Design a protein around this ligand. Sequence first.
Ligand SMILES: *CC(=O)N(c1ccc(C(C)(C)C)cc1)[C@@H](C(=O)NC1CCCCC1)c1cccnc1
Ligand SMILES: *CC(=O)N(c1ccc(C(C)(C)C)cc1)[C@@H](C(=O)NC1CCCCC1)c1cccnc1
Lengths: 304, 304
Amino acid sequence: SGFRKMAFPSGKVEGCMVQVTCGTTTLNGLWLDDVVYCPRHVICTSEDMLNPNYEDLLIRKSNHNFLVQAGNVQLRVIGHSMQNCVLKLKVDTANPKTPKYKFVRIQPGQTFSVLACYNGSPSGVYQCAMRPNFTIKGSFLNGSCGSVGFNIDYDCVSFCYMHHMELPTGVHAGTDLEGNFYGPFVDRQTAQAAGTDTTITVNVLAWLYAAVINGDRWFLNRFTTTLNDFNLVAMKYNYEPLTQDHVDILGPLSAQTGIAVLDMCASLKELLQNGMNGRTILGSALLEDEFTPFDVVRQCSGVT
Amino acid sequence: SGFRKMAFPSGKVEGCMVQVTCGTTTLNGLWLDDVVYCPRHVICTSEDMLNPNYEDLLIRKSNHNFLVQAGNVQLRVIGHSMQNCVLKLKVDTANPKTPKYKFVRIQPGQTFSVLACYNGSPSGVYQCAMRPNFTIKGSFLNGSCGSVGFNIDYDCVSFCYMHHMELPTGVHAGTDLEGNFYGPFVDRQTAQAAGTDTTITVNVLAWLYAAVINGDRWFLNRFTTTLNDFNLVAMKYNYEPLTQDHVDILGPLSAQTGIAVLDMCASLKELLQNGMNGRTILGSALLEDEFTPFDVVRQCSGVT
Ligand SMILES: *CC(=O)N(c1ccc(C(C)(C)C)cc1)[C@@H](C(=O)NC1CCCCC1)c1cccnc1
Ligand SMILES: *CC(=O)N(c1ccc(C(C)(C)C)cc1)[C@@H](C(=O)NC1CCCCC1)c1cccnc1
């Protein structure tokens, strides 16, 4: 019983975190096999942060210019290449603690565990979602960049996020581990505004199904609705459209609880049109949209 | 910028988690040096769960009766002793991944990271507080017992909690790692009711100071108050008394933000007497009391 915002165990990732220093600027790096991955803005100086020419900064740069440390252990650099907004550093030693690993590009609404690091040293973990506007609401101070987001499948670590920068909003933008930014952002000090953020509808429904399982079911109404009728009320409240793929994914939660997806859709419409009246669902006075159907199943099943 | 519920890295603890089987019943164990710690209700059967005689169950029990596994590796049992509500099992091998470790008994309101485990295999981490009634609002399924709560000081792991049982409420009770239960609970199936839970006042103030730092300061009023005057309104709203030790602990947050503790006390009184009017503080429509002053400093400082 009970329902908490839950991260994966960070042990597998803790042993991949190194420090990458280049001139004055230091930040976090990921060490998998004989390669060290980090943000490409480690070749920036306080002058070039406005609009840096990264191709002309990497050309005037050699193997020995990059300083990489794993604790009090120094790695030699044998090669360097730039891929999009990521630096890749070939190194003489292969990481002896490399896990089974994949690189995947997650979709909006998909969640992951973040390990926040400063000087290649972990300081904590939290769970969060890739927002529809392609930002994340995270907790990152100066020197947090290079920190990674990941999910665990048995003993295989799927890396989806590397952290880069903060927007004037106080929210966070970053890349996959091929160096492609999530959303339309670039790595420089400029006027980058995230779009109006919507609510991850499929995630709020999944959260409501968790509440029913854990004994909180005061919000369960006596109506039903249609996809089209619900999707009309969704757009009104800045809720992402519900798809035939979203209803299919909820089928498992639908089956277990004995509540048809469109009945839960109808219940949600009532919560949106009437509010909560200062009541709590799983100890929250808000609608929580940072839990996936797979998150709810995992936590209400007990998948190790 | 940003503020999240944040756990410590679980890597150090992941390598201390073993399985303890005894007859039919299996649960989670902690392996530090040449000793394995687990709940004493592993010597219970489905008959004796009502009111077990643990002294008369351990007497009719030998070293070989206990099965301990670390992955696909079996440990030999050389000794066994019962300490309060905890089993201690001496074993031929010493854990090669034992960290620097202490056993401490945390106070009500003090927070820690929980690593949830099933069959000696971790499944995730979350942060939570020891409630004033001496329960915790956690996420635990069947076989979660033996899972531990901890804090990290540099590279030293302070173990404060071992999980045991769930109350009809759907909330959780457990022990320190000398086997003494937090609160007045016993390890059997009986009528155990937790008291009326109060709010951790010192933690809500600390949370409000984090909000000011992260740019959310709409709730900052133009009044001040006294300890006695505030403590009167606290008891009214089931808020734990504020002490001269609580105001001292907030002094660092007071200094940095330029807001005197009693001014923040006055602002809190207004939030309690008027509500939030459907507004959000650090993305929460509730007052969050599961962040300590040290948690807020750590997360707003960047302590690894
Ligand atoms: C890497 C890092 O921690 N930060 C950072 C991010 C981006 C850059 C440039 C791409 C070179 C502009 C440099 C340094 C810092 C940080 O100072 N971010 C600012 C970047 C400019 C706009 C305002 C934020 C940082 C701090 C907190 C969270 N993430 C990154
Ligand atoms: C150890 C375990 O997972 N659970 C458990 C807890 C306590 C006992 C006895 C002390 C022998 C009664 C046995 C097993 C289970 C569980 O079934 N708890 C129930 C204990 C009796 C009252 C109702 C709960 C468990 C499940 C979920 C979370 N924690 C513990």
